[model samples]
Structures are given as structure tokens and as C-alpha cells.
Target: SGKMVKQVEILSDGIVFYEIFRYRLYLISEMSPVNIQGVDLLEGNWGTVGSVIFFKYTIDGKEKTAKDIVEAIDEETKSVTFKIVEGDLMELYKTFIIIVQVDTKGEHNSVTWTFHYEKLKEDVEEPNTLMNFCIEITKDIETYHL
Candidate 1:
């Protein structure tokens, strides 16, 4: 098992990202067209725990889609976690989990991207590129607030 965590500062309230991730991808996709192509609701209703979402995103110039289910969420804490069941990533790791959390302080808030997974083979490298993609999202959204 391996875990990777990344933190980046955002220029807006933490709630903003939580809302976008929860039920407003339409809003986010508008601003982040280069990173986010589209989103689809799958298993359940939107924004609820246990609901599934499929996201089309580009990273490293490659377009990919990920099937993720909401595993945990706290609107108050501005945090959400997703379990990846199907996707381009599942081909590399047997299990994959993603957690995004925001910490509010003074004026600027920060977001942390956490990835937990076990690779199917020892030869598989860490998903550092994906982490960069996540960071780019926060940075892009930060532009709107500024």
C-alpha cells in the first residue's frame, strides 16, 4: 500500500471547492475546460454519499475518464473522499482512493489532495502526474476568485 498527499493554496473559501465537487461540476467545467471535459451522474443522486460519478478529464495531454463513488463527505469540513472503481487508473492500481480537503484560514484557504492505493505490480510507478493534475485544478479555480 502507498499513499501520496499534496497541498496547494487556493484564493477562495473552502466551501467553494466542496460545492463544485459535490453538485456543481457544470460550473467548474466551465472554468476548467482544459482539465475537465465533462461529468456524468451514475449510480445515485448527485452530491449524496454513495452516489457514483464519472469524470472526463485531461492530464498530461491524455484524455481519460474515471468512475468514482462518493465514499465520505463532510460539507462542514469542506472535504470529500472518492473510491475509484473503474477508470484509466484502475489499470495501474488494484485499489485507489482519493480524498480532497480544504483548510480555511485567515483569508486564503488550502486544499489537500490525497491518493491511497496499492499497485498491482511492483513495476508500476507512483501517480505523481495525477497529483500535478489535481494541483492544476485548484490553481485554475483560484484564478476566478482573484
Candidate 2:
């Protein structure tokens, strides 16, 4: 298994970041809707563990769709992790997980994204672009809230 981590300053209230993670569907569907090319709640309740979200987004203008599930959320730590359970990504990766954490108890609140993934083959490359995509989304969220 391989992991890629990216951290970016939110430049916003930690509480607001926490709330955005808590109610992520709103962020995706309303606040920063343009961040992702397209999104739909496919199964279960949004913001709840086990809920599945389907997304249609362009990676370098190449459109793709992914089905991910809310794996876990830690209120005390201000973190939520999503696991990509199915979709086009499965063909290239054995596992893909996106974890977002905010530090609310710090002087300058910031968000960290941990991308844990395993490629299907050793020849496959790490997801550096995907990490950038996550960072861009974070910026959009920060902009929406600010």
C-alpha cells in the first residue's frame, strides 16, 4: 500500500471548516458546487457514515465518475475519511481513501488531506494530480465560507 499526503492552509475559521466537513453534501451541492464537475447522492443519507456519493468530474478535462462511501468521521479531531469503493478508479487502484482533517485548536486553523491508495500494479503512478484536485476543492470551500 502507498499513501500521498497534502496539507493546505484553509485561511478560515476552524469551526467553519469543521462544519463544512460535517455537512459536506451542502458544500458539494450548493456552496462550492463548481469544485466538482458533477455530484449525486446515490445511496444512504448524506453526511452519515456508510453513505455513498457518486461524482462525475473532469481530471485534466478527461471526465470520470467515481462512487465513494463515507468511511469514518472524528468529531474530536475534526476529520472525515471517504473510501472509494467502486467506479472507474477501481480499475487502476486496489484501494483509494481521502481523509480531510482540520485543526480547530490551533492559532491558525488549517486542513490536511491524506490520500491513501494502492495501485493495481507497480507500474502505475501515484495520484499527485488527485491530491491537487483535493486542494483545489479545499480552496473553493474556503472561498465559499469566507
Candidate 3:
């Protein structure tokens, strides 16, 4: 009852889209200038599971922050997941995980964003809004053809 999972899809021509969730995440801010404000590696190197990243982003017209640690990287399935340790979302959620995966068939591409989290209270509504933010930002990245 405290957890939720929401996914969205995006289209791209090349598998380069997967790199964004890996070491190239630093470029996300530039890819989504309006939605993401800034990004910095807090500790460790990019693409490593233990690396930490700090992101300043906007959601629902309000600027917010999230401190994410690269918890997992999956090469077999083209996936990477980030766990938020601190941020505006932490105020209401105990855990916030962002998992992005990609698959392609011929030229048709689909990117899946999975929001897995546990809320702190039953009163807090599900994070559909946050999920939408992910969808739109992924669309932002799609335009770069990466």
C-alpha cells in the first residue's frame, strides 16, 4: 500500500538513448533545459553503481531538488536505476527510485521509465505528477536523438 510503479514510453531512432541513464546523465540538464536546471556528480565517477548525483529540476511549475545515488546498472536489459537519498520528494516519500529501460524493434523504439517508491503516509497521493515529469523530460531527451 505504500509503494507504486508507473511507466511511460518514448521513441528514439538509436540505442544511444540508454547512455543518458548511464555516464551521460550530466548532459541531461542540457537535453532538458526547461525541466532540469543543473546536474553534478557528488561522489564517485559517472556510470558506477555507487556514484552520487545531485539534480536541480522543476516539476509542476515548482523547482525541486533530488540527491540520487546510482544503485544499479543493467547491461543485459539496458537499464539503470537511481535511488533518491534526499530531496523535496523525501518529505513525503521514504524512497524514490527512478528506473529507465529501453528496447527496440527494427526502427521502432520504446523507452520505459519506472517510478518505484514507498510513500511515508497513506494520505499522500500517488506520484503520478512526478511520473509525468519523467515522461516529459524523457521526451525532451528524445528530441536530441540520443
Candidate 4:
């Protein structure tokens, strides 16, 4: 095994901000899928605070569940937040939080994901793997919604 790496980059990192909205679509779609799992995903609301959702899946081939609650959402600003209520991810850090914000106007749009996390060791880092998960889920939702 190797030591975990931690890296942080800003808006200047290279990619545009619009990626956040797509990721939001993915997050909701995956968490509230119509087929992925036999059971349906439960989210408190489509886009709002106090929204709660539960994800059911088989990790390591073991059945498990995770709960997520929306912290905030602003339609005019196109932003939303979710915090892990319960799940295996809680095993990594005391808190796992993610926020997505997007703007759409005059063919201009941007999305950003703000991740705030803490790990037990230096080896643990921001889970890009999870980001991909959110983005992919957004794609599916787009396809389904469209």
C-alpha cells in the first residue's frame, strides 16, 4: 500500500464550472434511479433543503444503504447541498459534504462542486471516484428526463 495523496486546485485548475450542474443531475438520477436497483431511491425533494434521500446498493457484494440530506438549494442561483446522514462513507471521515451550483443564462452556464471532507489519515483523499459517480448519474437523469 502507498500513502494517500491530497491535492487541491482552484477555478484556475483548468476545467470550466458548468460541470457542476451535470454532476447534480447525475447525483439525483443515480440516487433516485428508476431501475439501477429493484427498489426505488428516495429523496426528500427534487431540489430544496431538508430534502433527504436514501441510497441502496451492494458494495463488496454486501447489501448496504446510505442516507443523504439536502442542506440548501437556490433556484435563482442554481445551487444545492447534501450531507451524508448515514453510510459506509461515514467510516472514512466524521463528515462528508458536497455542494453543487450552476448558472444558466444567454447560452452561458457553469457548474461547480465544492467538496469539504476530512479523513482519518493522510492517505485518504477527496474521492474523485464518487464525483464520477455523480456525473454519470446526472447523465442518466438527463437521458431519462429528456
Q: Each candidate: what lDDT?
A: 0.85, 0.80, 0.83, 0.53
Model 2, runs deviating above 4 Å:
29-34
Go through the candidates in order and give the clash count of each. 0, 0, 0, 8
Which prediction has the highest TM-score against the true structure? 1
Q: Where does candidate 1 stray beyond 4 Å?
A: none
Candidate 3 vs 4: which has more lDDT = 3
- Of the two candidates 2 and 4, the one with more favorable lDDT, higher being better, is 2
Best lDDT among the predictions, by candidate number: 1
Off by over 4 Å in 4: 1-48, 57-64
Ordered by TM-score, highest first, the candidates read 1, 3, 2, 4
Per-residue accuracy of model 4 over 57-146 as CA lDDT, tens digit each:
543346656677878766666666777768877777677777766545444433455667777576776677666555544444444444
**Deviation (Å) of 9 in candidate 1:** 1.0
RMSD of each: 1.5, 1.6, 1.8, 7.5
Can you give the lDDT of residue 135 in candidate 2?
83
Q: In model 2, which range of ten residues has the least summed lDDT?
A: 26-35
Please give the lDDT score for candidate 2. Answer: 0.80
lDDT of 4 at 35: 28
For each candidate, give its TM-score against the true structure: 0.92, 0.90, 0.91, 0.61
